[PDB]
Amino acid sequence: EQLTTKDHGPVFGPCSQLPRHTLQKAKDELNEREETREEAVRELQEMVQAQAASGEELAVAVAERVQEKDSGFFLRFIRARKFNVGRAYELLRGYVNFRLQYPELFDSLSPEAVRCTIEAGYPGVLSSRDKYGRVVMLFNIENWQSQEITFDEILQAYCFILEKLLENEETQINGFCIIENFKGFTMQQAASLRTSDLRKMVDMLQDSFPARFKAIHFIHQPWYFTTTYNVVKPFLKSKLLERVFVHGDDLSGFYQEIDENILPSDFGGTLPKYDGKAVAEQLF
């Protein structure tokens, strides 16, 4: 403990120094400041082609994609799998396979139409970090219409946001956190959700991206939220299922994990209404 919300660096912009005992926090997940990082990428890079040498359909496609990638990129998968070369490659397999499982998020991906979804605040990105230093994700279901914005467009925006925020080294070491504001979650929206869309989102959150989702928060959800929850519930692994938190209207243990002071007005915070325009501009 003994850490404030301002004891951390910035989001969005790629980092510079690794201080604030986050490098020590990194060391607390099997990291060493020394010769580890350098060769680990090399050991992975060597592994990527070595397993592709067997002529396996996926392993080749894996080596096909990352053939033109930088050293920092491969280190993401190392910091994601607590510095384990084997585990890191398995994540990379699930990484590539995710694009193969779902091409509707990476095919005709025009960056011009994506920003329009981000500026709509879907999903939202808190410009500040939590008391643990994680990128707090935002999503307000109130007044959301599926006919205007597809569930897939959200994930497309979700991916791009994840693709770029993981440049920041402190994000890789601290992780992420999503806030789901289900105040305006009507039964009309409940039924209009496709089960395949939920699998699509869960397949993202699990074993695909080098991110450390450390908490999921649901607020102001109705009495019938458990209906949708129990359908997703089988999709979740034990690791993530235990990281999902439902509060309702009793936020007695909510404003400890996520400080109110850094929260928008949309999420019971002191800050003004979430602005998707300004956040999207910092991206591009």
Side-chain angles (χ1 to χ4, degrees):
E1 216 174 356
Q2 303 177 4
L3 200 64
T4 64
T5 178
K6 281 194 50 53
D7 285 23
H8 300 95
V11 209
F12 310 103
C15 189
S16 304
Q17 188 203 1
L18 311 90
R20 312 165 177 105
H21 76 75
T22 60
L23 188 57
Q24 181 184 6
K25 175 183 179 179
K27 290 184 177 182
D28 297 333
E29 42 124 306
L30 298 185
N31 178 21
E32 299 180 354
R33 190 183 181 183
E34 34 272 17
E35 311 168 2
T36 49
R37 327 177 183 184
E38 303 163 7
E39 296 186 4
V41 169
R42 186 182 61 88
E43 296 166 21
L44 187 62
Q45 181 270 345
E46 176 184 354
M47 175 179 299
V48 168
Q49 281 289 352
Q51 307 298 334
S54 62
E56 197 271 332
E57 187 173 1
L58 181 62
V60 167
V62 167
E64 181 180 1
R65 290 301 185 93
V66 302
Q67 65 182 3
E68 301 179 353
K69 279 290 184 175
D70 59 322
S71 172
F73 163 75
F74 289 83
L75 231 175
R76 298 198 179 105
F77 292 76
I78 269 65
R79 297 193 178 95
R81 280 297 169 262
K82 295 202 186 72
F83 286 67
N84 192 289
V85 197
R87 298 290 154 84
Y89 178 76
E90 298 298 324
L91 221 182
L92 181 54
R93 296 182 65 98
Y95 180 88
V96 180
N97 188 30
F98 182 75
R99 283 177 163 78
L100 309 182
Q101 280 281 331
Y102 305 108
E104 65 273 351
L105 310 180
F106 302 94
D107 276 26
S108 61
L109 192 58
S110 177
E112 187 174 359
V114 175
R115 188 179 185 174
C116 304
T117 307
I118 307 178
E119 288 181 354
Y122 297 109
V125 180
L126 225 190
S127 57
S128 183
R129 299 179 171 266
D130 51 24
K131 80 174 188 185
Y132 300 99
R134 311 188 308 264
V135 185
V136 182
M137 301 303 300
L138 303 177
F139 194 90
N140 199 342
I141 205 55
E142 182 177 354
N143 298 16
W144 178 76
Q145 294 178 356
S146 52
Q147 65 278 17
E148 291 186 348
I149 316 181
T150 79
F151 199 101
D152 304 271
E153 283 177 354
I154 309 292
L155 304 176
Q156 294 161 6
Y158 254 104
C159 291
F160 186 86
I161 287 175
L162 289 179
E163 284 282 357
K164 297 300 177 296
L165 287 182
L166 280 182
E167 295 174 4
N168 192 283
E169 291 178 324
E170 200 168 357
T171 289
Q172 301 176 17
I173 303 179
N174 289 328
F176 285 83
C177 191
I178 314 182
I179 310 295
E180 297 286 351
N181 189 22
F182 282 175
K183 178 57 182 178
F185 179 54
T186 69
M187 293 180 58
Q188 175 185 1
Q189 296 177 347
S192 66
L193 285 181
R194 309 188 63 89
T195 309
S196 56
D197 286 333
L198 289 170
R199 305 190 66 103
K200 198 176 303 177
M201 184 175 192
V202 173
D203 276 24
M204 167 194 302
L205 273 53
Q206 296 187 156
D207 309 328
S208 299
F209 293 78
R212 306 183 56 198
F213 302 85
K214 299 275 294 183
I216 301 285
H217 298 291
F218 290 90
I219 52 178
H220 312 332
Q221 81 295 339
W223 58 267
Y224 59 85
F225 164 75
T226 317
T227 300
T228 310
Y229 181 90
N230 295 336
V231 178
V232 183
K233 193 168 176 298
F235 305 156
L236 304 184
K237 292 203 309 173
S238 51
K239 181 182 66 183
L240 179 59
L241 229 185
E242 294 163 8
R243 294 187 186 278
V244 178
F245 299 115
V246 173
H247 306 268
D249 295 324
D250 185 27
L251 315 176
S252 60
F254 171 81
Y255 290 132
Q256 287 70 12
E257 306 302 320
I258 302 293
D259 184 25
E260 175 189 7
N261 183 34
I262 74 181
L263 286 173
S265 73
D266 304 315
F267 301 86
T270 64
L271 305 192
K273 185 176 182 304
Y274 172 80
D275 185 22
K277 304 188 299 180
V279 176
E281 183 176 359
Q282 300 202 19
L283 268 60
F284 54 95

